[PDB]
Design a protein around this ligand. Structure first.
Ligand code: NAD
Ligand code: NAD
Ligand code: NAD
Lengths: 75, 337, 319, 337, 337
């Protein structure tokens, strides 16, 4: 991640700015923190999918299943 | 006449081809296309000289690099691993016989339907809700618009007629099975790297156990027993034939002679050609090439406490399973829509 | 037939393990998953321009989702749009087909009243703010993003409209699972052991309650004793009839941490109307996935109990 | 110190000798006599070079035509098929270990008692009411005046501790078993003439089934289950180790994890050294030479309907059975009367 | 101390790792990297539980997804089929041990040299003029700037010391060989599609013959006999050990006892640790795990007409060949340049 890696810190800068400047308790900066939490949520969704990164078998049997390393004749 | 094709010219494919060469005259099926990962020179040799069924004798087998002449009958042949680049509409293919052990999903098997084939019969217990059909149990109840049908595994294809007979005659509460299975091609020969660890070990040396869901496929083909049938498998160093143990817990009590009588008359009325009944003291290698999909071994049937039955069934998972595949293919040819 | 299951919570759509336990129970062959962030009206650009969160009853096309939801009953393959999550934008839609079981989950699965008349079984999933903080500390600690402790100030800013927009939906759900800090254990971090409770509602037929030893008399049971050697701190169940929001409910409540096997089968042998065809089936469904978060406490117990009641409702709907 | 003897220096005899050579220091037993139908030059070679357990390494094996020097320790050796012409009182023999597979009757085995031996331990399920004892179940309850005792078969010796644990923890109504058994010496190599037809066929080629009463011997060693346990055996082409399937119908309902928990703690409290518990995905050849008489395979244990359990147990019928024979022999030495 | 690596953690790789675990103290080699097509969880299990050499006993084997702890000693592990994407310079690799059976060419094996490795020892008879070296014949005459060296096949590695002894003592005009070879991993288990037709057939069932040029590799490692040595191989269903027949046509006439005397004293002067000499009537399975690269079978040596000699040599193509690989690796560590 590089794009959302930057964009979360950009929205964090905006969270420091817009909710100290244009009203700490209103719909605008609540929308700002809601946006930053959604950016954080997609960081979480990226994080969990990279935790589930397979090493080899769900790659080499993803592309070429019938090799002898992963034939399964579940019989 | 229905133009049919074979995906994957392995054990099931070679046995399917040999069966159709032995059942040619009564066939609405003409085999017109095969594809393996080998060249057409090699697999013709592997068809003619099977180290399990001996040398083929009835018809002449030869090939060149584009076609295979089996007994004067020509058959086309190609080689590709992508199912999407395959000449199906160029060859006019109604039914393709999926036998690679790769395309078990609906989305995998439907690639042939997309690439220009009309129906696909997959010889594996498929992932997902693919309609499964066993000859002798529910080969009637398929809708002919179901173009993607699945035959189950060989163990299920053996076990389910016996379970049908015992469920109709006695009623089944629960049931276990433990099939002593011949070694298949998926196991590595020496101890080599493999996705499952118990199949990674040597095949000629070991009783390797494995967990299978093919007992649960009886609960698919018989709906009122789903979630009540489960069992494991034992792969032992025999190359061809196998036996399945089956422990059921019936509720209508009986003795060991009566279940043998029930299956003996069911062998002669309804399951004729499916279940053979043998009161001989045979052993495994006397069932290489038997036509029935289950030979009930009579002398070993036993009942404890009236409500607990055990049968054992010899079955050939390379020849009889191919016979049931070809019978299902002809039976879907007879009700083509 | 078409059956329908409504799930409500801000755990991220398709980002909670209750759907994983439902997947282990039914199977993704029999059910399909529908996120409900897809029916957003406009993007995070227009959220910034309109100054509005993703929680507004303006912010969704609530009528087109209703039209697809009603067309789900009629068997036709629906064409649902997709919220492009990284950009905030909207994908041209995907044609997906109905299944045996259809689920609906999002921030507003239940805000509409015609779909509230449509949903066959409903679940709200509540979270207390303390374990919200304890989960966001794990969120920004495992990732090491270094964005902590002003997310504390994001919490109470996200709070007030959320109580207006979302929390009155639980007055119409069947089952609502609250998760609290444990009163039992004190010398831990605040999110290890959960004090969970599944406020389930009487009335609507097919749905039984699951009562601990008696219908409708509060009973606080500790299974430690002659047959179970309890570790620290052990379990402390509860039960109680109640009237939540003026509605006849029956809270079933668990505090503690399941440390081993026999203390989890001994509890399951004493619950009643749990609708199992199989002895200990709830314990098997707990231990088919030892790696799932929250299996060691009552959250994994209650989620699979609710899913087992969903099996009961499905068997009622399909005879 | 108890002077002991070995009748029949076959597989069980060679394994018994090798076990005593590996458990020499803690032994009240001194092996002083063997007799086989071979000369003393050949069986010393067969002791040293076992094609199953490899070359013996710890002690030196040599022989001449009258004695065998194992590691400096001398042992006498003779050859006769008549048990009545044997020098037992001339050698001072308390316990002879019957391992020929011939003398299963009381009148057959008592020929050694007549010829001048004090006690006989026969390693076979004997015909007639011979008192049978399994180490780990009822090795305590023998009366020391019972001079003719019998260890059961290897299948019973594996199965009975599991049945003891499951009967104590859950209670058993009925129970089946189906042991996938390694091939033994009784089977003919090629298809040769034999008294039973299913053992007449080839051993390396075939799954040969056989009916055994060794499941009923659990009903001898556990009295309240007699007439409730029965099962068959499958001989598959593996040379050494075997696995036993066991289907019981318990009455106290439970799940698959709980029976594994019960057997796991029984492995660590009471059945220690009898039952090992393995949560690995091993295969058959990783149990050649294991010391326990039953390795419970954990991943395959299953329960259907709460009241129907299946376990499988690896066991080595050539090494672990010899270990239980030697443990029973030492345990009768410790309570010599 | 030389940091070494293993390409392909198959039979030769697992045996190499096990040998280095048994020869750790006298080693200038530290094994720091392996790569197989499997994950690091599986191959640690395959290292610990070998179904041929039993369970490993001396050190503890465990792993997680990035490293493998063998006896406390850590070793790195990765998975890639492209040799060009491999962290060699990142790991500091002097010598990589090519054991995949894939990279037999110079251009294939040199990919590791390009990717950041300093020397490569390939355990196969390589295509092209790769310098081949056999321990016990010409393990001295390698130039240390030859970074790409090849050990020959196991058959050549067994046969060449005997041919060296008989060529020095008697002089050889011509020579045949016919090795009865154990089945290797290249053969398909059942009759499956394969590049060569005689390896396509079943391994457990068949004596499959094959033509090999590994007899001619003796003409590489002994230069004055090139073009004079040729032979075939027979693969029979034994899993581990093999025997090689060797017919030479010597010109200095002699008898059968004298060649046994020559090889017996050569076993004790020069070929010590290479050739063992056995005057026992052993059989194949008594050579599983023998350390010598050729056990000359004494009782079968014969000479007809004075000038025509036949010897047979037992050799283990999975253990002794790994021993010679590790000895060559240490011998190139001792003359590192
Ligand atoms: N082995 C049995 O006795 C048996 C019994 C019942 C069912 N089955 C099922 O039959 C299937 C095949 O069994 P088999 O023994 O013939 O398998 P096999 O591996 O022996 O032969 C399969 C053949 O298909 C080829 N193949 C694989 N993937 C391919 C692809 N993508 N494109 C083209 N060719 C491809 C293989 O290379 C090989 O030629 C499996 O699903 C198996 O479980 C097997
Ligand atoms: N084979 C097993 O793994 C196993 C396991 C458990 C129990 N058993 C029982 O052990 C017994 C022997 O097994 P085994 O494999 O060693 O048998 P075996 O046939 O391999 O060896 C028996 C030996 O006794 C010799 N013998 C036979 N009759 C004799 C006689 N009258 N006098 C002297 N020597 C005689 C035989 O020639 C042979 O040397 C049988 O009862 C068998 O059922 C065998
Ligand atoms: N089998 C024997 O006893 C023996 C004896 C002497 C020499 N050899 C030679 O040793 C070599 C290997 O023998 P083996 O029995 O270990 O083979 P094998 O096939 O049993 O094992 C080879 C291993 O390497 C892996 N591999 C293959 N290509 C790879 C690649 N590109 N990248 C990474 N890993 C890869 C395989 O998947 C497997 O894990 C062959 O050249 C063989 O001829 C074998």
């Amino acid at each position: 991640m590089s794009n959302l890696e930057k964009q979360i810190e950009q929205a964090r800068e905006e969270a420091h700015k817009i909710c100290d400047t244009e009203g700490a308790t209103s719909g605008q900066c609540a929308a700002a923190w809601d946006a930053l939490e959604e950016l954080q949520a997609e960081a979480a969704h990226q994080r969990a999918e990279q935790q589930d990164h397979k090493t080899s078998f769900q790659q080499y049997c993803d592309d070429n299943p019938d090799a002898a390393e992963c034939r399964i004749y579940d019989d | 006449m229905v133009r049919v094709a074979i995906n994957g010219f392995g054990r099931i494919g070679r046995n399917f081809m040999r069966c159709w060469l032995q059942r040619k005259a009564n066939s609405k099926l003409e085999i017109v296309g095969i594809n393996d990962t080998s060249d057409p020179r090699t697999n013709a040799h592997l068809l003619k000289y099977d180290s399990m069924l001996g040398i083929f004798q009835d018809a002449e087998i030869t090939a060149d690099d584009d076609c295979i002449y089996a007994g004067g009958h020509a058959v086309k042949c190609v080689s590709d691993r992508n199912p999407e680049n395959l000449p199906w509409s160029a060859w006019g293919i109604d039914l393709v016989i999926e036998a690679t052990g790769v395309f078990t999903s609906r989305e995998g098997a439907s690639k042939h339907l997309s690439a220009g084939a009309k129906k696909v019969l997959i010889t594996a217990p498929g992932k997902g809700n693919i309609p499964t059909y066993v000859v002798g149990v529910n080969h009637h109840t398929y809708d002919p618009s179901e173009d993607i049908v699945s035959n189950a595994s060989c163990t299920t294809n053996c076990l389910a007629p016996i379970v049908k007979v015992l469920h109709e005659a006695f009623g089944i509460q629960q049931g276990m099975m433990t099939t002593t299975h011949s070694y298949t091609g998926d196991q590595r020969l020496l101890d080599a790297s493999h996705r499952d660890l118990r199949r990674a070990r040597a095949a000629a040396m070991n009783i390797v156990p494995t967990s299978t869901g093919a007992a649960k496929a009886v609960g698919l083909v018989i709906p009122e027993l789903q979630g009540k049938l489960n069992g494991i498998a034992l792969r032992v160093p025999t190359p061809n034939v196998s036996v399945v143990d089956f422990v059921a817990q019936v509720e209508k009590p009986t003795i060991a002679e009566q279940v043998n009588q029930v299956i003996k008359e069911a062998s002669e009325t309804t399951m004729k050609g499916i279940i053979h009944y043998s009161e001989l003291e045979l052993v495994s290698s006397d069932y290489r090439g038997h036509n029935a999909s289950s030979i009930l071994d009579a002398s070993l049937t036993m009942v404890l406490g009236g409500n607990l039955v055990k049968v054992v069934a010899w079955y050939d998972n390379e020849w009889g399973y191919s016979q049931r595949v070809l019978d299902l293919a002809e039976h879907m040819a007879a009700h083509w829509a | 037939r078409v059956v329908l299951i409504g799930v409500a919570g801000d755990s991220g759509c398709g980002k909670s393990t209750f759907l994983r336990r439902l997947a282990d129970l039914f199977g993704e062959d029999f059910m399909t998953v529908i996120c409900l962030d897809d029916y957003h009206s406009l993007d995070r650009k227009q959220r910034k321009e309109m100054g509005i969160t993703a929680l507004d009853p303006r912010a969704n096309n609530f009528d087109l989702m209703y039209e697809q939801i009603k067309a789900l009953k009629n068997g036709e393959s629906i064409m649902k749009p997709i919220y492009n999550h990284e950009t905030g934008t909207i994908d041209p839609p995907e044609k997906v087909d109905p299944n045996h079981v259809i689920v609906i989950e999002g921030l507003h699965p239940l805000y509409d009243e015609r779909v509230r008349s449509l949903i066959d079984f409903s679940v709200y999933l509540d979270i207390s703010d303390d374990v919200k903080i304890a989960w966001k500390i794990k969120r920004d600690m495992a990732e090491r993003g270094h964005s902590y402790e002003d997310v504390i100030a994001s919490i109470n800013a996200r709070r007030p409209d959320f109580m207006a927009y979302i929390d009155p939906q639980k007055q119409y759900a069947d089952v609502v699972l609250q998760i609290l800090p444990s009163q039992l254990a004190k010398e831990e971090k605040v999110g290890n052991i959960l004090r969970v409770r599944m406020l389930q509602r009487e009335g609507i037929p097919g749905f039984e309650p699951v009562y601990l030893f008696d219908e409708g008399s509060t009973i606080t049971w500790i299974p430690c004793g002659r047959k179970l050697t309890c570790s620290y701190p052990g379990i402390r169940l509860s039960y109680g009839p109640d009237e939540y929001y003026g509605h006849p409910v029956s809270v079933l409540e668990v505090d503690g941490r399941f440390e081993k096997l026999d203390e989890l089968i001994y509890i399951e042998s004493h619950l009643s109307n749990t609708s199992t065809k199989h002895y200990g089936e709830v314990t098997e469904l707990l231990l088919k996935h030892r790696d799932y978060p929250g299996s060691d406490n009552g959250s994994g117990l209650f989620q699979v109990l609710t899913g087992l009641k969903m099996r009961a409702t499905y068997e009622r709907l399909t005879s």
